[PDB]
Amino acid sequence: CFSRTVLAPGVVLIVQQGDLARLPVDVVVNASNEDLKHYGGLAAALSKAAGPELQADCDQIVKREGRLLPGNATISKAGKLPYHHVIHAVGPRWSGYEAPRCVYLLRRAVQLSLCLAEKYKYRSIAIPAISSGVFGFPLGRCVETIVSAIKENFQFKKHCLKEIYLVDVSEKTVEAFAEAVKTVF
Ligand SMILES: Nc1ncnc2c1ncn2[C@@H]1O[C@H](COP(=O)(O)OP(=O)(O)OC[C@H]2O[C@H](O)[C@H](O)[C@@H]2O)[C@@H](O)[C@H]1O
DSSP: OOEEEEEETTEEEEEEEOOTTSOSSSEEEEEEOTTOOOOSHHHHHHHHHHOTHHHHHHHHHHHHHOOOOTTOEEEEEOTTSSSSEEEEEEOOOOOGGGHHHHHHHHHHHHHHHHHHHHHTTOSEEEEOOTTSSTTOOOHHHHHHHHHHHHHHHTSSOOOOOOEEEEEESSHHHHHHHHHHHHHHO
């Protein structure tokens, strides 16, 4: 654990190193593409551990609801992962020509992820540095946008959610999260 920040009474933000495929939390957020096709990065690790259940429920979801748009999130079965569900958030693909829009869409992915958690009555959620890998979002802007989006969501005391974790395997990204929490709070 790298930091702990009370967001509201009985609600904490925790930055931690760890593996989203195996955390003692209720649900996790995947950094997905629009097709819910988990063939790279975090998505691939999750899907591998999950067995084909997760990709198949995801195919049926696209084959039912249609392609997801950037900024949106949906939920699927988790298969063999230690969760009932995986929340798939589609971060934006970074363009330096549209940086404000990109920030908007990541904020949105984050907030919709939180809304889905609330809706399925979850009290703990873990979230990665959505968009900061293959999708190319500048790591610094990326982790501040996520932390700020989480800060806005609890500008009011009220929440099902009691613990929100920001998690990555790599320590640089985790440090980046811990710094963003300093700067933002
Ligand atoms: N094998 C891995 N295991 C755990 N974490 C990983 C792994 N690979 C990358 N990560 C971390 O997860 C975070 C998100 O990176 P990506 O998974 O590349 O997410 P985005 O950048 O949101 O990429 C979305 C796209 O990538 C995949 O191809 C996915 O199917 C979609 O097309 C980054 O911190 C990255 O270092």
